[PDB]
Design a protein around this nucleic acid. Structure first.
Lengths: 77, 76, 77, 76
DNA sequence: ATGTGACTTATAGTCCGTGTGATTATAGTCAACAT
DNA sequence: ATGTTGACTATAATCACACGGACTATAAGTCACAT
C-alpha cells in the first residue's frame, strides 16, 4: 500500500527485537492495545504521529534515533 | 499537544516557505483540503503517516530529506 | 471427549462472567497464560487439579463454592 | 503440595475403603496402573480431571457423590 | 497386598505471535463564513 | 491568500476473544524391587 508505512513498521519491529522485547511488553510500555502492535508489524497499519511517539517511548528510544534508523531503512537495496 | 507533532508541522510549513509555496498550492499539489493543510500548520492536526506522505509528495521532497530536516529541527 | 471437563470448563466461564472478569483479568490473577484460560473455556482442555486450584483463586472463589456450582451444572436439564 | 490435592486423594482413599477395595482392584476397575494409584493415595500425583474421572468410574461413584464428599472432607 | 525408585512418552502448560469481528475515539474530507 | 467553526464519514485505535506452532515442565503410564 504505502511506501513509508512498511518502512515504519519494519523499523518498529527491528528495534523491538534488538531490545529483546516481545510484542506485548511493547504494547504495555507504549500504552496501546496488544493487537495494535501486532497489527502494525503484521500487516502494516496507518498510524498517527501521536501513536508513533508512544511506540518510540515504548521502544525506549528517542524521536531522533528512531528517525535515523528510519532513514537507513528507506535507503536500502 | 505533542512535541513531535509540532516539529512535524513546523517542518511542513518551513519547507513550504523555502519553496515559496502557498497553502492553497500545497493542497492543490497533494490533492488534500486547504483547510486540512492550514490545520496541520497551526498544529491542530495529528496526521497519519499516509497523510504525511501525501504532503511530502505535494512539497516535492523525499522522505529522507524530510526526516533529515525533522531531526535537525528537533534538536533546537 | 470428557463429561466432567466440559462441565468444569462451563463453570469456569460462568463464574468469570458473573464476576464481570475478562479472560485477561482471569489469566492474570490465576498466573496462567491468557491463551490457557481461552483454551480451557474454548475446547474444554484437560487441566490439572493444581491448575484448577489456581483458577479458583483467580476467580476469587473458594474450593467449596466452585464444587457446589460444579455439582449444579452437572445436574442440569 | 496442595490442600485440594490432598483431600482429593484422601477422598479417593476414603471411598476405596468404605467400599472394601484394594488398590490393586481400584487400578483394575478403572483401567489404570496400580503404582499410579498408590502414588495418588500417598498424594504424589497431581491428577488431571480426566484421570480423576477414570478413578470415579473405577470406584463406581458418580461425579456428584464424589464432589459432595470432597466438599464435606474439605471442611475439616 | 502396598510403596519405592527410576526411567520413557505423552501431554499439560508456557511463550510469542497471528487474525478477527464489534465497539469507541478521532483523523480525514469538505461545507460556510472570516479575515 | 489564510483561519476557524461545525459538520459528516472514514478509519485509527480499543477491547474481548479465537487459534496456531514451538518449546518446556510434568503427568501419564510401565519396568524392576522392595515390604
Amino acid at each position: 500500500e504505502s511506501f513509508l508505512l512498511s518502512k515504519v513498521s519494519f523499523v518498529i519491529k527491528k528495534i523491538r527485537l534488538e531490545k529483546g522485547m516481545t510484542q506485548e511488553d511493547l504494547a504495555y510500555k507504549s500504552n496501546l492495545d496488544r493487537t495494535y502492535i501486532s497489527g502494525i508489524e503484521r500487516n502494516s497499519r496507518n498510524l498517527t504521529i501521536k501513536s508513533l511517539e508512544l511506540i518510540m517511548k515504548g521502544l525506549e528510544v528517542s524521536d531522533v534515533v528512531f528517525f535515523e534508523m528510519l532513514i537507513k531503512e528507506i535507503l536500502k537495496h
